[PDB]
Point group: D3
Chain length 176, copies 6
């Protein structure tokens, strides 16, 4: 109510709007316009957002952690409440270490929905206070992925519409 600190610290649920801090994990190898759109839309409705970049994915990425983090930072510089960071644990454990209460997930295809539901159940088991929030990609970006853009780019297809200029130039550099 006012000086209620002496009586209670406060619960998360049932009591109105709490501070929100979101993580948006992925490999971002490299960040595409689809990613930027998602994080832009998240940053608009949550207090803070961390773009969390997986340091050691399963498949060796085309860009190293240091390149991924630098490229996303530049592309996201225009969002004042977004911070880019690397991580190397369960998104849940990083989330806890970061005191995040929102996990952002992009929801691109029907194929993924079953996996996303399962991951979310597991994440609720791991970190009950972590709420997963799902955003569909803009129509513009619904078919693109980092994977697809790299493979089109390797064979010289035009991918300028899908990447920020800083990433597109880095990408060309990687491909000779």
């Amino acid at each position: 109510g006012s000086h209620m600190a002496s009586m209670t610290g406060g619960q998360q649920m049932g009591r109105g709007s709490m501070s929100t801090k979101a993580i948006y994990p992925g490999t971002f190898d490299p960040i595409t316009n689809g990613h930027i759109d998602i994080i832009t839309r998240a940053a608009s409705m949550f207090d803070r957002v961390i773009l969390a970049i997986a340091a050691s994915p399963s498949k060796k990425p085309m860009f190293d952690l240091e390149e991924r983090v630098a490229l996303a930072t530049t592309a996201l510089q225009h969002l004042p409440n977004v911070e880019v960071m690397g991580f190397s644990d369960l998104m849940a454990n990083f989330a806890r270490a970061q005191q995040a209460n929102i996990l952002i997930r992009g929801l691109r295809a029907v194929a993924d929905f079953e996996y996303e539901m399962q991951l979310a159940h597991m994440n609720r088991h791991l970190m009950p206070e972590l709420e997963s929030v799902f955003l569909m990609p803009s129509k513009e970006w619904s078919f693109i992925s980092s994977s697809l853009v790299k493979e089109v780019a390797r064979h010289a297809g035009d991918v300028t519409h899908f990447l920020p200029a800083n990433v597109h130039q880095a990408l060309m550099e990687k491909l000779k």
Copy 2:
């Protein structure tokens, strides 16, 4: 700053699944409206009045939620209410496909409206308003899936 979210549905009637969604949503957004469809395609068991009153009581305890009836284009309602976020729960794959389509259409009608999706708790993952009805309409226990005010009103409808 300010977030104002609409959670639309038919809520005929509101279940524990809905309450879970709206509770979670109302922890993340400054205000939430449960927007109850006036004139659903399939004529419902409870009318708007009944639905709105049951929901109002079921969510009375949440400080920052309001229950209202609407009967126009969600774009115009959200705009009327100056809401920037549309909340939908996603139970099943079938429902995602259809919600994705509506999201695209709403992006066209109202570019400044953000659609956002939540998944049910595992506890409520199988319930729906339709299922609770059909079970109770053949005397199955549904007391676990509904608030008392709603259970009673349902029992009352089936007598």
Copy 3:
């Protein structure tokens, strides 16, 4: 002890697809009942009596199979017939979510009831009572899909 299984549906009329499902169940379970819903959601083409009759003839050659009607929750008719098993035909991924819903609810209702899911034969994987009738209603050929008693009945119905 024993296993007693229920294969519910409207069977309006029964097709070689159903007859396959029940033949396979009847080979792995001591008794099986073909439970023909009396009051389906839409009005049937054949009334329960015609249906129960047609199914009875069609399945005469199966020793441990009984054809009955039922108008209530499956968990009730199961209880009533002292059945421990529920047979569900499982054709498409598009059915699987809905079937998994009903399975959770029937466990909630009747936790001693087991839902068992059989895939139809590739031969019958695209047919249904509905499609068979729609096709027949415009004089398409459906002789491959129905036993003769049913095929004769249907022809007579469409005059």
Copy 4:
């Protein structure tokens, strides 16, 4: 070969390209830009295409057969190899009556895929010489349907982008 008619009329498989005539069945209540895209693409790759309009859909249509047929005729009259007709039969029977050998189906959502496959098995059983061919909608028209356009229009939403002018007028007139 030369004049092998005395010897054979020829069979459809194993012997190069044959004349193609497609039917594109639906209720088209009313025809949208999505429909127009499908059939335009069809008409560019097959010799003739018939837009087949279901006389008696299961749900009562907003436009009657006569009105549906007229609206489509107009929307499609710039395609020289397209004809619009009503029909009240199995698509397979109409195609037989019409001596069609291709059935066009639009393929918009995951949810329909298995239904479509099942319909294609039925139609193969009914008319072996009928081939089903599946086209996806343009990104541009991926979300629209007649149903959704009608319900948006009923509530005064702007649907001018999804319909040809003749249809958009007919529609406002129904909903006055």
Copy 5:
């Protein structure tokens, strides 16, 4: 007829999900074999001998259930064991396409082997060895997932 069933998988390790599935299979068929794949595609955390041991202990309370290894076509092992039933536990929609494939192919390889699908308990429907392991490769209580012996064994394996 007499009913003997095969329940194949890697079971690396077994979980309460499997145990639930095999229990339910067990309770409708005379005998059930938990058929453990010897050489799975990726190398397992537990070797065949450990896996069989963990399983045997876990299911020891089920009289009519026997664990075994197998390193061939499922259809052949089934023919060898004179099994007339194959047990698949259907969790997700995604897997159902792939399981429908295998079932058609097994019908081709072994026409006398009937495929039977059981859906998991709501409780267990998200759990999967691979998940558990990858959780346990970091942290988080899995006591409710695994049986005691498996729990302990896994704990040991960690470091």
Copy 6:
């Protein structure tokens, strides 16, 4: 007027299902190229040379089909070959989501290329290269699913 279509794939090896698709496609389009991917991400069992050779013999009977290796962007290949139609077979729901994504991308890369989709025959609806290889590898009879030339070459590979 004239139509020229590409059917791209890995065809490692070509099966009866692929032959069915291309036969059907070559009856509706003037010319068809079977385009065989030179460098698949996964290393194939048969190299490009063997894959093209087997495919060439398998489709030798079809007057208006040519089998070619490619190792570039389909858009440039189709452009190189002056092809205006891309043919993909569509077996499963999984395949459809992915195929729809590439079709959008291809429409961005090559607006004048029309993507077209065919369902397998019921006969071949469950087969794939991967599955036939896996059955063969454990001695399963797969003679019904491949041409003689291809069968012989597979048996050779697996010795």
